[PDB]
Design a protein around this nucleic acid. Sequence first.
RNA 1: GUAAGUUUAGAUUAUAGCCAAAAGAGGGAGCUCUUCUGGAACGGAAAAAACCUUUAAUAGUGAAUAAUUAACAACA
Lengths: 68, 148, 78, 131, 279, 59, 103, 166
Amino acid sequence: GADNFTLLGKPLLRKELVRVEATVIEKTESWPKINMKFRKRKNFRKKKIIVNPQTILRINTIEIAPRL
Amino acid sequence: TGRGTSSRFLTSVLHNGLGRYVQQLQRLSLSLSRDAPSSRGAREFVEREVTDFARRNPGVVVYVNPRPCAMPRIVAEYLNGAVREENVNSKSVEEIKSLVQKLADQSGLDVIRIRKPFHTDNPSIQGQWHPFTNKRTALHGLRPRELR
Amino acid sequence: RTVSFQAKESMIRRLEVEAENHYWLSMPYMTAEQECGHAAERRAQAFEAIKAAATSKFPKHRYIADQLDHLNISKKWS
Amino acid sequence: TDRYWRVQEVLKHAQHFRGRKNRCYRLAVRAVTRAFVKCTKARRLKKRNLRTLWINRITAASQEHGLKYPAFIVNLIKCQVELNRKVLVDLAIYEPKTFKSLAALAKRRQQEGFAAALGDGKEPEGIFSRV
Amino acid sequence: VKKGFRAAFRFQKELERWRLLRCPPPPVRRSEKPNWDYHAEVQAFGSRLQETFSLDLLKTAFINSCYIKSEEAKRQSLKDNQELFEQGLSFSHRCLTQFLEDEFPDLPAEGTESLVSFLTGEAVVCHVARNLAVEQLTLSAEFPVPLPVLRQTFFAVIGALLQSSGPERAALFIRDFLITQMTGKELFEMWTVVNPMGLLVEELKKRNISAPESRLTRQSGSTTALPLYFVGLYCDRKLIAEGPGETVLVAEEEAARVALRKLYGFTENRRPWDYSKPK
Amino acid sequence: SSFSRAPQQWATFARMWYLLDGKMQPPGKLAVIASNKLQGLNKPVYHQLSDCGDHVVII
Amino acid sequence: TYSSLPDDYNCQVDLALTADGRTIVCYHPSVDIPYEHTKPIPQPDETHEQILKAKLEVRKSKQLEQGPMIEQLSKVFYTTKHRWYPHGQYHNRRKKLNPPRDR
Amino acid sequence: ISRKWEKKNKIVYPPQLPGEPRRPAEIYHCRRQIKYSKDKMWYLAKMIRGMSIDQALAQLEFNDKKGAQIIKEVLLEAQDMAVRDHNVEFRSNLHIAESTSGRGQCLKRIRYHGRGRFGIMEKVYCHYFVKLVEGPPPPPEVPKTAVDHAKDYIQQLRSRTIIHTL
RNA sequence: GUAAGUUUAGAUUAUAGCCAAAAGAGGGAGCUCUUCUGGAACGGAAAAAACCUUUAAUAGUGAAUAAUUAACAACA
């Protein structure tokens, strides 16, 4: 999108028209998530934690050209 | 648990990657014992992999202090002020190497639930919708039912 | 319980799809005679592997290194 | 000799409870487990609820332009547009001018779609209906 | 009496945890605390920034007048950072002003001064330095380091950096680390503008443009306790800027603010500043 | 666009007043429309907890 | 009149397929309200705070009682009286001291 | 048994620096063993909270409960030490900052009955805690007016942040 | 189409359902039995152990779908 105009892919724009670049900032994981399945006599020790990985990206530049 | 736990929004320390990426970890402290089964993996790590990590990352201050110690411990300090301690009790060389690499990649930012995975300082470009949007005007700005 | 219009259409679609299955099953490419023995070689080979795998159970070997490696637990700084 | 820490483990999760439940280990333990299960169950429904919210906002925005929600989605699909519902809400909120242009495309395709139905298929595909 | 030494030791740790929460220790600088090497940290500090610093000059920049007094007081019972401080502050003012002018040539000199002052404010400098661990590397006789002393070192380090790496590297450092702080900062947030209507007219007469005629474009809930008024400034019967407000005065004031941004090319949709340039 | 934060919030969250004529009009159809306007469902950013309902006047 | 939507309220919409046909381009220049369709500023020559104070007038028995005060507050804001009633200490302390704010 | 209330009177502050306001005096007084119910005594404590030394004493003089007489005696003892030991210049310049009662060690006996029944007899004892701050009682709170309520409500509405949005 | 099966030796545990739906027999309602088939949602039928859609369970602010309490006076 631009100030007064926009471009829509069908379903994607040509690679020449648009180039987008970003940078990786951090590699991290997810804060613990609690999983507990339902069962009779649940007990307190039937617990599992999920700490799946994570990563951070920072947008750097968006480039377009008059290649219509 | 979420009701009983805190949360934050997406944020960056000081826009680290805008100009150049800076490593948050600044100082590493290692305690070892000459004779201890718990430190065996750490003992071998110093022999082989400690040098490689230092060469790979020369900007982090590493302190290695072999001493009579019950449980070897690793302390990591970050630029933002975060300090993290990890026990090396009876951990293998491979486990130690992975942990240090993870510590270097991690930032001092708090690890809690993030409400929004997206942060933008200019969410709107064409203007935020308001009720007057798409409302047709009238000649002379006549309000409804105005006889004039 | 009066039947909803949506339910009737769904049942009709299932019947129509099944009708197409009937047609494509109405033209057997190979006759009965051709089918006989066409896969005999493959089936015989497969069973031989099954028999070999099934009858391969036995107790596992023991190695000196396992006993000797335990002594390494006492390694320390020089 | 560590039974105190076992009680503390339950207590830390039950500090925010109210009444004798928060201070009775018999009751606190039961509540802690129920809370954990409730959070686990909420994970599945939370995603579904968010999708419902996105659809509702799109319908309100679409109706303001005079376009029904099913028509907008179908026309966009016919236009080979693969924007997700969450992004569709985002464009309307922060890009009203773009959304109006998007509405025109859906409306224009709808007009061509109506013409195609009236045409009965004899007529060639419309300029905006070309794939 | 429960027997055992491990259990008794465990309770001692429990007591310590409660004691720490009840009575947090007084803050102390990392320099006094053990396992601190100034030389190693400076080398790591320079390497982390990917910048070349003259160790002697950098130490002088970190050295402060207050720090010397403590050493002299201890001595009774060394080069200041003033020279380096002036270079960084003076150079930064020119360089910071240069950044503002290039993007916004139309913006008046007075506005640039407000922007430069805000970007060079003690709080702004203090926030960057503290988050950069500069406080730990700062040499002073008091902890937490006083802000004016901290600000002196920040520009003093810039002066040392200029000698070590030249203006070009420092300018990129300033752009990468200081100009970044203006992201998300609106013009009037960083510049205090009173009487926008008068200022807007003053600019227009300079451009030989007629003063706009205010009109009420839209109104809602006028007689309610939550009224919304939209006021558009019409110049030569042409709307130049419109702003929302709760009262006509507020709406007119808000509309004037929008025009000032447009006059200086500070539109919200304006092209973002570039940190990409390696040159 | 380019408006200040607080005025933009005020305008977006402002409540509107609507007038309805009931002469020879079925209340049920009017009620359905009235519910949409009263609850604030007529806004693109409608939220359950935003208290975005609007005033409806029926004559 | 190629555009299928009115261009008179929000912005002019110009829809155009690209020559290659791989892209759809929308041009949306904003439209300003006509001068003739706007009202002038009030010609006759008061702060909202004064109006708010006047609305909650103190007339009877000097300061009115809590109930009437709530009713007067409720009438102004078209709210129920139940909303205005205070709450006990237990919940008041529970309120988070430092709520996060983003954008 | 714990006697931390007395230790609060043994706290010694560091010497005040020249740039420091004159520290107001704080006096803690308690009676550990009273043959009185804490619950009944609490009623007296709750009412007197925040009142002046003279006003509380005047009310106690005309009170019918036995506990009230004890409270006045406790108040007088605290006042005497305040001037004697805490360098209080004006006796009248005192107010009741805090007043509360606690449970004390009791005695257990069996309650006989004429028809062969028995009951649980208890001799109740209680503790009483009061903290006195030099100076007049703080001014009373002023209830919020309608205008104040409306302003906060508008402020609260503005403070609202959009939930679950981009 | 597919991968288990037979024999030899040692050895126990389980051996009491529930409801739905078919086939019979007592019977004449409904019941009382005998035989075959199926079931144990976090979806749906209003709440719904027994009916319908559903191969296990993992994180994600994605997507296509299944079942799915509703239905549209008479004379030549």
